[PDB]
Amino acid sequence: IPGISLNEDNSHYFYTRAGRRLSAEEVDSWVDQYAGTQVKELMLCPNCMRTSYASQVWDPIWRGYDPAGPDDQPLLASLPPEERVAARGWIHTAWQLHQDGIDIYARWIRRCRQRGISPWISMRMNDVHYVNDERCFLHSEFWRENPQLRRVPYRFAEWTDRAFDYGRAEVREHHLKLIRELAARYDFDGLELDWMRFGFHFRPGYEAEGAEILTAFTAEVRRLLDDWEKRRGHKIHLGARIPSRPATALGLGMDAVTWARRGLVDMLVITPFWASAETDMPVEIWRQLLEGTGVTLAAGLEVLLRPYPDSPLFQTNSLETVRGAAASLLDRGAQRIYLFNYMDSQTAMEDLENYPTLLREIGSLETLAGKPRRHVLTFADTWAPGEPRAIPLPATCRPGEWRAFRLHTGPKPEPGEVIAALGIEGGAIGPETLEVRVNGELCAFLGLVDLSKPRPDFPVYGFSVPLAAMRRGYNLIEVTARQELRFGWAEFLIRP
Amino acid sequence: IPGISLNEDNSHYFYTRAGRRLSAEEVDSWVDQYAGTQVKELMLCPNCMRTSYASQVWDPIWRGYDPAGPDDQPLLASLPPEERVAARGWIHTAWQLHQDGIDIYARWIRRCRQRGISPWISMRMNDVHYVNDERCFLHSEFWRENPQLRRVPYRFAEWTDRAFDYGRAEVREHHLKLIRELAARYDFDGLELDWMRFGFHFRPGYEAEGAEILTAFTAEVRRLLDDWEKRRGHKIHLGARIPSRPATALGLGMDAVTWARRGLVDMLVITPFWASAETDMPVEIWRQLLEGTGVTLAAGLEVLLRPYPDSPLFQTNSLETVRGAAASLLDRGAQRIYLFNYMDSQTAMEDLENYPTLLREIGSLETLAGKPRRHVLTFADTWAPGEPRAIPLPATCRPGEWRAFRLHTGPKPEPGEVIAALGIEGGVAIGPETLEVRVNGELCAFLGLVDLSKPRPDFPVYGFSVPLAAMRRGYNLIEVTARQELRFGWAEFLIRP
Numbered sequence: 006i007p008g009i010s011l012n013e014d015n016s017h018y019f020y021t022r023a024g025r026r027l028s029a030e031e032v033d034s035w036v037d038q039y040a041g042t043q044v045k046e047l048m049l050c051p052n053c054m055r056t057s058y059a060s061q062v063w064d065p066i067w068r069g070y071d072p073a074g075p076d077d078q079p080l081l082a083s084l085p086p087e088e089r090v091a092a093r094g095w096i097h098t099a100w101q102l103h104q105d106g107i108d109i110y111a112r113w114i115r116r117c118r119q120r121g122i123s124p125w126i127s128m129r130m131n132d133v134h135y136v137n138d139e140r141c142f143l144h145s146e147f148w149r150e151n152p153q154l155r156r157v158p159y160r161f162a163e164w165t166d167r168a169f170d171y172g173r174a175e176v177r178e179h180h181l182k183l184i185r186e187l188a189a190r191y192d193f194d195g196l197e198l199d200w201m202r203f204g205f206h207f208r209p210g211y212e213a214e215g216a217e218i219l220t221a222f223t224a225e226v227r228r229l230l231d232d233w234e235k236r237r238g239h240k241i242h243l244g245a246r247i248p249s250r251p252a253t254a255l256g257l258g259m260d261a262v263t264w265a266r267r268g269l270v271d272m273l274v275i276t277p278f279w280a281s282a283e284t285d286m287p288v289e290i291w292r293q294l295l296e297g298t299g300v301t302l303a304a305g306l307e308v309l310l311r312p313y314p315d316s317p318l319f320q321t322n323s324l325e326t327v328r329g330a331a332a333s334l335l336d337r338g339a340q341r342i343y344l345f346n347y348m349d350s351q352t353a354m355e356d357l358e359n360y361p362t363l364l365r366e367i368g369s370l371e372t373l374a375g376k377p378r379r380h381v382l383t384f385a386d387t388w389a390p391g392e393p394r395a396i397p398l399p400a401t402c403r404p405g406e407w408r409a410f411r412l413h414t415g416p417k418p419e420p421g422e423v424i425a426a427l428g429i430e431g432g433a434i435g436p437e438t439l440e441v442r443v444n445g446e447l448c449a450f451l452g453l454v455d456l457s458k459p460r461p462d463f464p465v466y467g468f469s470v471p472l473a474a475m476r477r478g479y480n481l482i483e484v485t486a487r488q489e490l491r492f493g494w495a496e497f498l499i500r501p
Numbered sequence: 502i503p504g505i506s507l508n509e510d511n512s513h514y515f516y517t518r519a520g521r522r523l524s525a526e527e528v529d530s531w532v533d534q535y536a537g538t539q540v541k542e543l544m545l546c547p548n549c550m551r552t553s554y555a556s557q558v559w560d561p562i563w564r565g566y567d568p569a570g571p572d573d574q575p576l577l578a579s580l581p582p583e584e585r586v587a588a589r590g591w592i593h594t595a596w597q598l599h600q601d602g603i604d605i606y607a608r609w610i611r612r613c614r615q616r617g618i619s620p621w622i623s624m625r626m627n628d629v630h631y632v633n634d635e636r637c638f639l640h641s642e643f644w645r646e647n648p649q650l651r652r653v654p655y656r657f658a659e660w661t662d663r664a665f666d667y668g669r670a671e672v673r674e675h676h677l678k679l680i681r682e683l684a685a686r687y688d689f690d691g692l693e694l695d696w697m698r699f700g701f702h703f704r705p706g707y708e709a710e711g712a713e714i715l716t717a718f719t720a721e722v723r724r725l726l727d728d729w730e731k732r733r734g735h736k737i738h739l740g741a742r743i744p745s746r747p748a749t750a751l752g753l754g755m756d757a758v759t760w761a762r763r764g765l766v767d768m769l770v771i772t773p774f775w776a777s778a779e780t781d782m783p784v785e786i787w788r789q790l791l792e793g794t795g796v797t798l799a800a801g802l803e804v805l806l807r808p809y810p811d812s813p814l815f816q817t818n819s820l821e822t823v824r825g826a827a828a829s830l831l832d833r834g835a836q837r838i839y840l841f842n843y844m845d846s847q848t849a850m851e852d853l854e855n856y857p858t859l860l861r862e863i864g865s866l867e868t869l870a871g872k873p874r875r876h877v878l879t880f881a882d883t884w885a886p887g888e889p890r891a892i893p894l895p896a897t898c899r900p901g902e903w904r905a906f907r908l909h910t911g912p913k914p915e916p917g918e919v920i921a922a923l924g925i926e927g928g929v930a931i932g933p934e935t936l937e938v939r940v941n942g943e944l945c946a947f948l949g950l951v952d953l954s955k956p957r958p959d960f961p962v963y964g965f966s967v968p969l970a971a972m973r974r975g976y977n978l979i980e981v982t983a984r985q986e987l988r989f990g991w992a993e994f995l996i997r998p
């Protein structure tokens with residue numbers, strides 16, 4: 006009964022259905038796969054710097070597009086020939102829908118309402134994909150012509166260096182124009198301000214003035230949607246995506262506790278940016294901060310599952326690791342599981358065969374109960390400028406030294422097997438090279454563990470955990486090495 | 502004004518006044534030095550595992566002591582000779598006070614009231630100094646006979662591995678006996694439960710059950726003081742020292758937000774353990790957490806000022822660096838600056854001549870305005886078991902890479918000089934263009950080598966002149982890129998109005 010909020014990105018549908026000539030019936034069929042699942046809300050993203058619909062205030066993705074022309078036309082000249090094909094799929098499918106008199110977002114909203122799903126619009130507030138290519142098709146002409154509106158003029162080390170500065174009245178006006186348009190065009194249940202595309206909105210050093218500035222913006226948005234409530238005759242929700250820790254969120258000019266205490270929002274999605282799902286987020290701290298405000302707190306998953314920022318492995322979550330992250334977060338008081346980049350194809354779990362089951366299981370502790378789950382150690386990808394970073398892996402243990410890893414495993418396990426699994430990097434070990442304890446109790450050596458994906462490219466060794474040692478919430482692995490060893494992977498496997 | 506809370510530890514007075522014969526008048530005079538300062542409360546600590554007063558429920562520090570005997574006597578046997586002298590100064594002075602019918606805490610409490618100072622008792626909840634020496638004088642017999650009550654039986658790698666397990670009913674009862682005696686013997690304005698000596702109270706992995714346990718314990722302390730409030734005829738406050746970040750505080754079984762919301766405590770002191778003062782603590786998050794509770798939030802300073810955990814430097818704060826910490830934390834909304842280890846001698850600021858000035862300035866922005874201050878980058882020394890650590894220094898910048906440091910420098914500077922000062926390790930001297938330095942994106946001019954007064958590193962510190970208008974209220978962001986590989990070991994803002 007917490008349920009699932011699921012995000013469809015601005016590009017996916019147009020890329021993956023490219024070359025078909027979609028009937029209204031096919032377009033509608035896309036909502037149906039989520040019908041009768043634990044999905045309460047579809048968060049339909051219509052935009053990056055450009056819209057995928059036929060906007061009158063912003064650039065549609067096809068601004069500059071010659072439908073009858075060759076791939077190397079001006080709009081696409083800047084990509085290599087292979088990506089021209091990919092990008093033209095998105096551009097051409099979205100344009101061809103428009104020419105057919107099909108508004109994909111109005112169709113999806115109307116289909117959502119018929120199948121008993123609450124339809125949301127989620128707006129990217131500051132997308133910067135491929136801003137290293139200034140002639141790139143998916144940039145607004147507003148962006149292209151106003152380099153003086155970028156947050157970091159003195160350097161280009163990162164895409165977020167060329168993000169819009171919401172410190173500028175013209176940047177806030179530009180984004181308010183789209184919001185005004187979306188609220189007039191579409192009869193949604195909720196607008197979501199996706200601050201986490203890409204989370205960086207201000208000059209470095211200006212984030213405190215920043216926090217005042219996004220609070221006043223969110224209030225003007227709330228007052229706008231109030232007026233539309235009278236025009237639509239129903240309640241219209243305002244939500245926001247924000248970083249996973251309060252100090253990083255406030256540090257990036259997002260004071261959500263103020264937004265919450267003032268009734269500017271009624272839903273908040275704590276999340277990482279992209280580099281990995283966080284399996285461990287301070288949900289109970291947020292619940293205390295948000296107490297009495299009646300905001301829905303949603304715990305945001307990402308599709309990738311990676312042990313540390315510099316890992317060369319890029320694989321996704323499986324049903325077992327999502328079950329792990331969901332069991333844990335629901336257990337900490339998350340009032341929704343929010344999925345991002347978990348779409349029906351291309352950007353999606355690698356075990357796509359299990360997507361129907363996933364959408365029917367991870368919205369409730371009751372449906373995850375007695376089901377195999379995996380609780381993997383990852384990291385927070387997002388930090389405020391100069392904010393000290395806390396990255397648990399990789400971690401070297403010298404001989405005679407102790408290291409501890411805490412992992413949140415949500416509800417006390419059902420009867421069955423519990424394994425503490427540790428990945429060792431650099432080419433190793435015997436049964437006594439590690440001494441392993443969970444909550445102080447000695448674990449038996451099991452041997453090499455045959456992990457299914459996601460998995461590291463180095464040996465993972467299993468330690469058997471006395472079932473009685475396992476506790477509700479955090480469980481503490483404490484290891485000592487008799488040989489210098491570097492860990493690059495840690496999880497609990499639970500098999501009821 | 503927010504003002505100052507100042508903690509007197511359980512051993513300092515007895516050590517420093519050793520061999521004097523102390524009359525009631527001299528004992529009282531220890532308070533007077535704080536009279537007319539910005540100090541509002543003195544936190545009088547009467548205990549480690551042993552009491553410094555003549556307890557009837559716990560071991561006094563002199564349990565086993567032969568007053569007439571030599572230094573080489575059972576109680577002191579375990580120390581080497583030159584530490585016997587020091588320990589014995591504490592033991593004999595605490596004992597001799599008692600023998601003369603002087604209850605030092607009763608005299609200090611009484612004298613606090615005469616001087617307009619609010620008198621508090623601060624209990625050490627789980628002191629573990631020298632638990633490596635099971636024979637040591639300062640351990641309780643209860644601790645010595647009951648190794649099965651310790652929080653980590655399977656290794657000894659840290660003093661906190663031999664701390665009491667507050668998950669045991671026997672450990673709670675042992676600690677509640679002292680509290681019950683403290684409330685009956687001393688008519689104090691408040692009790693502080695100092696959890697932060699040494700912050701580690703539960704078996705590894707038991708910290709969530711721990712959280713319910715310390716809330717229930719706190720609640721019995723409040724119910725006990727409610728009774729004494731009727732007996733004594735005035736309000737008695739209850740406070741706690743807890744970690745500096747709410748995540749770390751809850752991960753060690755301290756759920757202070759529950760204590761506040763339920764009306765158990767009316768002062769929380771956020772603090773490091775010891776290894777350094779934190780110049781940067783999330784005061785705004787704590788104020789949001791504590792909103793509408795009426796709890797006083799005090800920002801805890803320690804006397805050491807060190808740049809990273811592995812630093813071999815062990816220099817203290819100066820007046821300039823406490824001015825800096827104080828300006829910053831009051832400007833974020835601390836309702837008290839709380840001083841631990843800033844005593845009148847031995848455990849003291851190294852520039853001790855400036856102690857009277859410090860006590861009349863750091864408790865208000867008004868008394869800090871117009872004064873030179875230093876804002877130094879340090880680190881948080883305390884982290885919950887398995888909790889990932891965020892430690893900004895040292896930081897290595899490769900040629901063409903950028904590195905950011907955020908330092909909270911409180912109110913916008915008055916007109917004057919603002920220096921971003923950066924210490925570079927590894928026996929390198931840079932040029933004026935080896936570093937490009939920016940503050941809130943504005944290009945800083947090269948000043949040269951800065952002449953720092955202590956605390957200072959033992960490597961060169963290079964000054965960058967910051968345009969005044971660039972300096973912002975609160976956090977100010979140093980961004981640096983190196984044209985040669987460098988390691989930073991120090992960062993600070995110097996503000997000279």
Ligand SMILES: O=C(O)[C@]1(O)C[C@H](O)[C@@H](O)[C@H]([C@H](O)[C@H](O)CO)O1
Nearest residue numbers: 014015016017053134143279346352
């Ligand atoms: O933001 C993202 O994490 C992402 O959703 C990932 C997805 O795999 C990719 O196809 C889209 C796409 O790059 C944008 O929609 C273009 O604007 O972006």
Ligand SMILES: O=C(O)[C@]1(O)C[C@H](O)[C@@H](O)[C@H]([C@H](O)[C@H](O)CO)O1
Nearest residue numbers: 510511512513549630639775842848
């Ligand atoms: O905890 C501390 O930081 C400290 O207060 C520091 C001080 O410099 C030292 O003298 C005392 C003493 O070690 C205890 O009082 C023993 O019980 O400890």
